[PDB]
Amino acid sequence: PPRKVLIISAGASHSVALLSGDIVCSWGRGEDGQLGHGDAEDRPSPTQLSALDGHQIVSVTCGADHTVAYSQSGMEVYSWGWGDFGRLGHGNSSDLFTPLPIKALHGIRIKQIACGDSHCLAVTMEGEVQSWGRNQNGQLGLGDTEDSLVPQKIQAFEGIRIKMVAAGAEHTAAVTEDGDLYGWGWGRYGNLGLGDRTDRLVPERVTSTGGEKMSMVACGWRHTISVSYSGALYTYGWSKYGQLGHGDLEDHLIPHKLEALSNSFISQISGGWRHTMALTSDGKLYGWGWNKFGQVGVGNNLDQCSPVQVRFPDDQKVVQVSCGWRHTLAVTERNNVFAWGRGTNGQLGIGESVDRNFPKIIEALSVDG
Amino acid sequence: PPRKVLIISAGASHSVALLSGDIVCSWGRGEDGQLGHGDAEDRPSPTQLSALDGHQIVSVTCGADHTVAYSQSGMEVYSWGWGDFGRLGHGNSSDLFTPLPIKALHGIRIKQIACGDSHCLAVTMEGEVQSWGRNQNGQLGLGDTEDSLVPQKIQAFEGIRIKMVAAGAEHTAAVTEDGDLYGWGWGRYGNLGLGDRTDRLVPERVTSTGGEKMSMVACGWRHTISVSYSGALYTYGWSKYGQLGHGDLEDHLIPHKLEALSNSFISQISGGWRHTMALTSDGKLYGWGWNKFGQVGVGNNLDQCSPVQVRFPDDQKVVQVSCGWRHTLAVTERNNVFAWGRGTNGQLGIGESVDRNFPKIIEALSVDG
Ligand SMILES: [Mg+2]
Ligand SMILES: [Mg+2]
Ligand SMILES: [Mg+2]
Ligand SMILES: [Mg+2]
Ligand SMILES: [Mg+2]
Ligand SMILES: [Mg+2]
Ligand SMILES: [Mg+2]
Ligand SMILES: [Mg+2]
Ligand SMILES: [Mg+2]
Ligand SMILES: [Mg+2]
């Protein structure tokens, strides 16, 4: 059976993938250790992270300048990259250039991990949440403003099963299994969805949801995106670059339904530094927001304040998308992998390359060329 | 004759110089616009910043990913680079890839400018201070935690003439004309020198100064360095990497005299990300701290928790030094410029280059070769 990409993830200037055979690979900026190869050099093409061979990794997730992965059979979570503020979770601030297990999470059944700039969170199979890293604006949800170098349980969610979490620069969001939406952390751009510009040190429930329950949530750097059980898309927070997608640059302090997509059912979402991607159930990918480096993928370098469909060869359907700070990655139905946007750190994975403003196939990871 | 280098300054991954004939040149990482050439590309050799030709610039100063310059005759301050949190001072958060005048500072007589990660300060000829940028931990000294997109006067210094200021990641320091030392902002590693690990939202006087008045102050990322009226060197704050220079890895919460340099009179100081430089009155340069990329300049890649002398061809004396995040620049008595450390963004200015662990001459800017 031909080797394929199982999971992709984009960080600020790097890219990580999990391949069949439980193989982790990475490419892009390596200076802070985020690629995991033991050295500090950029890799312009996918490079196997051999130290994780045989660890049966089942998922990978990038933060801005660090990476996390976990194994079910090993009951282990691993982290590597820039170590400041405790974002790696090991009880110190050391950078790591090679993956190390987060001892505090050993033997815990992991459901999902989210990574922001300087903090991370893990959701357990029982719907509990642990968080770690920078906490200067309450983004850990622990009720104070002191950084945590190790994971701590978010006690505020006692009795509340969490389905998934999301993390931006310095804020955090979550949805419950029953459909409630929460926000906490740095809130100055309205990005918590609470109708104001004030931080929260513990999770606070978003009450203005258009009467709808939310099935998923994702964070860009200072904006937030959610999807309801009817497949409607909502955005809130920072609007400067059109990343909210409402056809203007208006601020939103509560979730605002994106009307242009109302006839579609959104199945996946991703928030970048200053851009946004949404995938429909029919496999159409839409992008919007900042496009200086071509990261929206629509064949130009003009910013886009309304969703525009990203096009692929033969109109192949998209199945996964992940936004970096200046680039975007996607996987299609044909098991092809594409990248676009900024390429100066090698993050596009296509060897030495100029920036790209529409999707470019990553030959190393694809069936086609 | 090769133009005289008047001022050098290092940022996180970039480098800037002012040459005789009032020309500015920059090199290194260009992604955030910090080089000011209108494009976003790294430059591995010194490149003239044409936009400032004829603007009579007398000083340049780098922040992490931005740059500031000012003209005495034009009575103008210019800034460019990453614009988030208002670090450029224009009343918006836009990045600039070419310099623009800070309109709020027009006509003001500037004595000195300091740039941190995301905040800046300017001292006036009358000894007043104005600050702008990120303020989440009180680093602007304005008594609150709201970011400022334009310069604002530090009212706490009314009646107190300031001589010079300094800024780190998220903290700030100052010395007065009368020799008092102050600290404010993020204080979690003891870097304010106030004997604790808590923040200050307004300037607070450092009372433990070894019984000495202070003439100079500089900040690294999370450490602070001062020099007394007798030329003694003091360091405080973070020493995870030995950047305080006391021969161990212990943090200090108040200024601590660096005894190994007690037989020298220190005349210049610079703090980097995880390393430190000090220059004696007889032109000897000492470095210490993190040396993973060779940024201490001592010809190896061993970390140094004590000051070690950086050596130059023919023992030529050093007159200026500036630390970046992973590199260091210096200018010698012979008007040669040298660089060392990390070179991947082109910050050493020597054309395409591997990292260097001892000083390498920048031929483009130097009398010798
Ligand atoms: Mg190594
Ligand atoms: Mg606590
Ligand atoms: Mg509307
Ligand atoms: Mg209206
Ligand atoms: Mg506005
Ligand atoms: Mg290049
Ligand atoms: Mg200067
Ligand atoms: Mg960076
Ligand atoms: Mg001599
Ligand atoms: Mg390179």
Curated annotation (Swiss-Prot), chains A, B:
It comes from the Eukaryota. Keywords: Acetylation, Chromophore, Cytoplasm, Nucleus, Photoreceptor protein, Receptor, Repeat, Sensory transduction. It is found in: Nucleus; Cytoplasm, Cytosol. UV-B specific signaling component that acts as a UV-B photoreceptor and plays a key role in establishing UV-protective responses in plants. Upon UV-B irradiation, UVR8 undergoes an immediate switch from homodimer to monomer, accumulates in the nucleus, interacts with the photomorphogenic repressor COP1 and regulates the expression of the transcription factor HY5 by associating with chromatin (through histone H2B binding) in the HY5 promoter region. Changing W27F: No effect on function, homodimerization and interaction with COP1. Changing W27A: Loss of function, homodimerization and interaction with COP1. The keyword Acetylation applies. GO terms for molecular function: chromatin binding; guanyl-nucleotide exchange factor activity; identical protein binding; photoreceptor activity; protein homodimerization activity. RCC1 repeats lie at residues 1-19, 20-72, 74-125, 127-177, 178-229, 231-281, 282-333, 335-369. Homodimer in the absence of UV-B, but absorption of UV-B induces monomerization of UVR8 and interaction with COP1. Interacts with RUP1, RUP2 and histone H2B. This is Ultraviolet-B receptor UVR8. The keyword Nucleus applies. One of its GO terms (biological process) is response to UV. Disruption phenotype: Hypersensitivity to ultraviolet-B (UV-B) illumination. Abrogated induction of DHU1 in response to UV-B. Disruption in a plant lacking DHU1 alleviates its hypersensitivity to UV-B. One of its GO terms (cellular component) is nucleus.
